[PDB]
Design a protein around this ligand. Structure first.
Ligand SMILES: Nc1nc2c(ncn2[C@@H]2O[C@H](COP(=O)(O)OP(=O)(O)OP(=O)(O)O)[C@@H](O)[C@H]2O)c(=O)[nH]1
Ligand SMILES: Nc1nc2c(ncn2[C@@H]2O[C@H](COP(=O)(O)OP(=O)(O)OP(=O)(O)O)[C@@H](O)[C@H]2O)c(=O)[nH]1
Ligand SMILES: Nc1nc2c(ncn2[C@@H]2O[C@H](COP(=O)(O)OP(=O)(O)OP(=O)(O)O)[C@@H](O)[C@H]2O)c(=O)[nH]1
Ligand SMILES: Nc1nc2c(ncn2[C@@H]2O[C@H](COP(=O)(O)OP(=O)(O)OP(=O)(O)O)[C@@H](O)[C@H]2O)c(=O)[nH]1
Ligand SMILES: Nc1ncnc2c1ncn2[C@@H]1O[C@H](COP(=O)(O)OP(=O)(O)OP(=O)(O)O)[C@@H](O)[C@H]1O
Ligand SMILES: Nc1ncnc2c1ncn2[C@@H]1O[C@H](COP(=O)(O)OP(=O)(O)OP(=O)(O)O)[C@@H](O)[C@H]1O
Ligand SMILES: O=c1[nH]cnc2c1ncn2[C@@H]1O[C@H](COP(=O)(O)O)[C@@H](O)[C@H]1O
Ligand SMILES: O=c1[nH]cnc2c1ncn2[C@@H]1O[C@H](COP(=O)(O)O)[C@@H](O)[C@H]1O
Ligand SMILES: O=c1[nH]cnc2c1ncn2[C@@H]1O[C@H](COP(=O)(O)O)[C@@H](O)[C@H]1O
Lengths: 491, 491, 244
């Protein structure tokens, strides 16, 4: 009949202990009754935002600009766009993420019939797309007079300069349309049946109110996980500081349509951060705030009291970071995640485990310890979507990976540095790499016997999930060992 | 007035000498009267094939399958598909290169109205495209009854299994068509004006004779340099051996539509190779033959007498090669290229400089010494289009790079190994990397004062082009030296 | 426009910065300067042959910069096949340019004060240093550490990181150099080294050194690679290279 109890509960693992890292422990295997592919990875980012994937790209200038944030959101994670740039640059990166996928396009590029083929080529150069509805004024609210696309300007070579759009358009008599007040699903069925690539939406006065594009329905079927708002735009996060000038940056990011703000700090338990959370929650009540760089429940209390919608957890972990060796201050990250999540769950506040995520097994550990999402810096650095360009050193394709408190960065791009300006080897695309992390998380949960990240956390808090501590020699034994050379071909 | 003569002519450089490599000499700078961008790189591959770029991907299993050959041809070079594979696999790689861009598609995928949406999706799965004309037989020469594309099957969810194409097609009453005997230029005008993505070509009996696709006109404007045959398909090369069973491989490659054959040997001056050249030139008189890895004029004579249309130059150079330390036999590559090209030019036979090309300066040297084209192995290995998958070893993104006499290749992938089965760090895409090599060749020619590769070779043979020989310490001084670390960020 | 700003800021000499100065573009710029600013000294100059030097001396340059593809940071030879071994270039161009009274600057590949004495002996009137003065205190930018070593950046002006306004081909490689201290101590060390080189040679000045070289009084010996080993630091376990 009976079998004895084996391993520690999480409450036991952190009680009789020094601060553990992810490397200091294993999760004991459970019972498998399900397929890894059926493991649900649905994740709370904040009180009101849910992601289909637990994964976040960190707000760093060598990790997250618009290409990373688009790719993360398409993979069912999110990106937070970094703030080591002008307020206007950051708002433009946010605008790029929000424009990439659209339901109703309500603020399209529009031209007059008095504009020219060269104005459509300049529009395509400046905004990326050729499909431009034509209205009497060349402003959105006028009577629809036609539609111009790349197939209409295709191979009209050097006629750019003075060819008026009127003779180039598909004229309004010829175009398929939907009435205003059509639902997105009804407009999609009209567009799908029409076999056209645009469907203009016009009111009873025959003037343009929105347009929809077939490329968004293609993006729909291409990206089943994608993190979208109610109007089917990709979710975007952005960082801001807690200085007075961050109020201007915050206003630019909110009119760019940012969904969630992260307050970027080494040590978020401050009068400056509590003041910024209160300022945001009064001025932009719709806006989700991750106020958050904490490692203790005492810090978490003050930000949850200030009204944060999520917390970022970690201090002095993080591959690029030297905060612990400069300020003495921080915590071992597994202990921090467990302590802060066990407290913050009482208030319904989700936890982001930030920094020190070197492997997909560290992601599964962070999630098992009570994180609702995991934020990666270096693990996503030197992907193709990460900012900047590759170079070669001793014989190796490398990309920069900076740290936002490195004294390269800061400098308006005595000053105390908290980071160290690294290099990282090439990883390829986020659109292949994040599906690998997803499958790794799913197989980790499967070996543990958890059908979802929600049941994984419930097994952890009930004490059904068992842990074993590792000696240093268990960390050697659990790594690659005894070989001459090896080829770590992940995915 | 007068200025004294400075440096050696090529004839002097190779006369009073040991065998020189590309590293052993420099070209002296000339006069610049032109922009590097106006340097013409037009190159003879063989007696009848001219490329817009001097660049060739080598027939190796870690370098050239169809993705590399497509990318090389699009960049105005060519790829030779390797032969360390079944005859049927190699011919299917050649078929993929020949199908990627089309003028008239005269052998399209066709279906019957009695086929289904599921048959169109399965056709798209096999061949990569959804644009399928419908004929009442579902075979090419028959009455056109409609056209089906991805916009016709788009967002039909699970209706695949039994929905007949008849009710899915654009019917023949609605479709824009051109008459048979229309020129490609005339069909392109009809297609461009129609704003459609296909244009079927039909005879007076209203049965399908060809089709054309707008995506080929897009590929036209996207790829100005592309190496195309008369019917606008990409040029493809293939390797073959000189064994009796290579006659079967050659028949498969010729019906797959290969444009040029390279006879793959370490030492091409053999009765076996001369017999294979004679066999090809009698059985396939249209087919271009590059014979001969040769390094002497005496070897070149026998293959030019056999009737080769081009020669490969190199023996025992090549990053992967160990022929010299296994057979004692070969030549320093700069000397070999100069000697063989100075002989072969008398017969109008172009030279491929093959192997030992580590840098774009080595390309400019090979071209200056009389090569009409340059073939690269390792320089194109670990591009994205190179066969196989990336791995990590020393914290470095690597791809395998094998060699064809290596002992891992000769297992159908006493045997004597002539190569060494190694690895190369990631390079990114051919479609970015070959424009960098092109621009580097152009700036090399510009510093030399040559407006084209044709005038560069004429300056070399007349003695206008001057060379200086390098000590080992000049090779140190000419490299990166005296630094602690460096970042070789090419392009 | 840049030239007009530099001339009203009071610049004394302009250097025309190119990999390969024997061009219609450079000869046109030399003519433009010599008519618009007749007071202004022009070093039009990145040459390695007498044929290149002729066209710039005919254009009216007041000095030539000599060197191509030498230079610690440089990859021009391995990107363009084009250049010359620097000792040969300096001697060839100086033996020609002295006929016209045009001084030569030997530029790049100067690693040691002995290379300065060789460049001056071979007919250079001045020597230009990049990397030998990089990571002095007066060199632009800030020190960092990597391998437990105090380093300053040293870029190359055809680095793709110098380009991008700090297809676009690179001619240089974005390196690092170890700290050297101040120019105001380091250049007096180079001066003393040049003076002792001249003294061991028996030359009382750089003018007599060049005259001894052109008359054939100054004698040279070629070195095998093993002479370049024997003439270096060799056969020790470790050493401290404490210059000055
Ligand atoms: N035009 C447009 N329609 C969309 C977009 N996203 C979803 N839709 C429409 O809304 C429908 C609902 O899609 P769902 O799959 O249920 O959920 P979703 O999160 O909206 O879309 P997925 O990203 O595919 O999961 C789709 O079938 C489309 O008809 C979009 O970006 N643009
Ligand atoms: N056309 C258009 N697309 C927009 C606009 N704003 C965002 N988008 C998005 O950009 C994408 C447009 O894709 P396509 O419809 O393929 O672009 P296109 O209009 O065909 O233009 P080309 O790709 O240049 O031929 C969709 O995902 C749109 O939602 C806008 O103003 N106009
Ligand atoms: N359908 C089709 N038409 C083509 C193709 N290649 C060229 N054409 C047509 O032939 C014309 C001539 O093109 P050119 O630019 O003169 O020379 P090319 O070598 O054929 O094409 P490029 O590859 O662009 O240089 C183009 O404008 C097209 O109308 C192709 O692959 N398919
Ligand atoms: N459709 C079609 N294209 C072919 C065929 N053989 C080669 N091709 C080439 O494949 C490309 C087809 O491109 P598209 O016209 O964009 O493909 P599509 O038919 O629209 O199908 P989807 O891309 O799946 O929607 C062109 O470059 C064609 O020349 C064939 O049998 N049918
Ligand atoms: N709603 C519409 N009704 C009628 N015609 C339209 C409509 N939308 C676009 N068109 C016209 O249809 C043609 C194709 O445009 P469409 O948006 O469908 O594809 P496209 O994006 O331009 O094609 P492609 O992807 O091949 O580049 C053009 O002539 C365009 O003006
Ligand atoms: N020659 C033609 N005449 C009339 N209709 C056509 C013709 N060729 C294609 N069609 C129809 O036009 C619609 C669009 O097909 P088309 O080839 O032009 O674009 P597509 O490649 O399918 O579009 P997309 O690139 O957006 O996926 C489909 O309904 C198709 O059946
Ligand atoms: O300069 C810095 N000093 C301290 N912490 C930093 C700095 N820059 C970024 N971080 C943190 O490091 C995390 C990324 O760590 P990583 O995933 O281990 O590489 C970020 O999300 C930040 O929390
Ligand atoms: O195994 C081998 N032994 C000898 N030569 C080889 C072998 N495999 C390929 N080569 C040659 O090496 C050339 C590529 O050299 P690379 O460009 O320097 O890497 C090829 O095009 C062949 O001529
Ligand atoms: O990017 C570059 N490519 C080529 N030559 C350069 C570049 N940048 C500087 N140089 C040359 O290198 C010289 C300095 O060489 P160094 O003293 O050996 O370090 C400079 O004075 C220039 O002539």
């Amino acid at each position: 009949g009976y079998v004895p109890e084996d391993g520690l509960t999480a409450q036991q693992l952190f009680a009789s202990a020094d601060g553990l890292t992810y490397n200091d422990f294993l999760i004991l295997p459970g019972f498998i009754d399900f397929i890894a592919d059926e493991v649900d990875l649905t994740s709370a980012l904040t009180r009101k935002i849910t992601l289909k994937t637990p994964l976040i790209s960190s707000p760093m200038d060598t990790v997250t600009e618009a290409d990373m944030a688009i790719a993360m959101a398409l993979m069912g994670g999110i990106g937070f766009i970094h703030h080591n740039c002008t307020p206007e640059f950051q708002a433009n990166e946010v605008r790029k993420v929000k424009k990439f996928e659209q339901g109703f396009i309500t603020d399209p590029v529009v031209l007059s019939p008095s504009h020219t083929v060269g104005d459509v080529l300049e529009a395509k150069m400046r905004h990326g797309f050729s499909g431009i509805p034509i209205t009497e004024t060349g402003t959105m609210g006028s009577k629809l007079v036609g539609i111009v696309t790349s197939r209409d300007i295709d191979f009209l070579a050097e006629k750019d300069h003075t060819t008026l759009l009127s003779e180039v358009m598909t004229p309004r008599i010829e175009l398929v349309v939907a009435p205003a007040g059509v639902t997105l699903k009804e407009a999609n069925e009209i567009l799908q049946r029409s076999k056209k690539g645009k469907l203009p939406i016009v009111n009873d006065c025959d003037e343009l109110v929105a347009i929809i594009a077939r490329t968004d329905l293609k993006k729909n079927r291409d990206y089943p996980l994608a993190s979208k708002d109610s109007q089917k735009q990709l979710l975007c996060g952005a960082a801001v500081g807690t200085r007075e000038d961050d109020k201007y940056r915050l206003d630019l990011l909110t009119q760019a349509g940012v969904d969630v703000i992260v307050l970027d700090s080494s040590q978020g338990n401050s009068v400056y951060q509590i003041a910024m959370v209160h300022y945001i929650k009064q001025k932009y009540p719709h806006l989700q705030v991750i106020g958050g760089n904490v490692v203790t429940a005492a810090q978490a209390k003050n930000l949850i009291d200030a009204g944060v919608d999520g917390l970022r957890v970690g201090m002095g972990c993080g591959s690029i970071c030297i905060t612990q060796e400069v300020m003495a201050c921080g915590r071992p990250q597994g202990t921090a995640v467990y302590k802060v999540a066990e407290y913050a769950r009482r208030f319904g506040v989700p936890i982001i485990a930030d920094g020190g995520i070197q492997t997909v097994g560290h992601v599964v550990k962070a999630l098992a310890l009570g994180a609702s999402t995991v934020m990666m810096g270096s693990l996503l650095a030197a992907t193709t979507e990460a900012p900047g360009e590759y170079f070669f050193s001793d014989g190796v394709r490398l990309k920069k990976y900076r740290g936002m408190g490195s004294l390269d960065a800061m400098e308006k791009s005595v000053k105390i540095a908290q980071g160290v300006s690294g290099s990282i080897q090439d990883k390829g695309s986020i659109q292949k790499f994040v599906p690998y992390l997803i499958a790794g998380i799913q197989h980790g949960c499967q070996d543990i016997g958890a059908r979802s990240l929600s049941v994984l956390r419930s097994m952890m808090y009930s004490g059904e999930l068992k842990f074993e501590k590792r000696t240093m020699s268990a960390q050697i034994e659990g790594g690659v060992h005894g070989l001459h050379s090896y080829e770590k071909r992940l995915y």
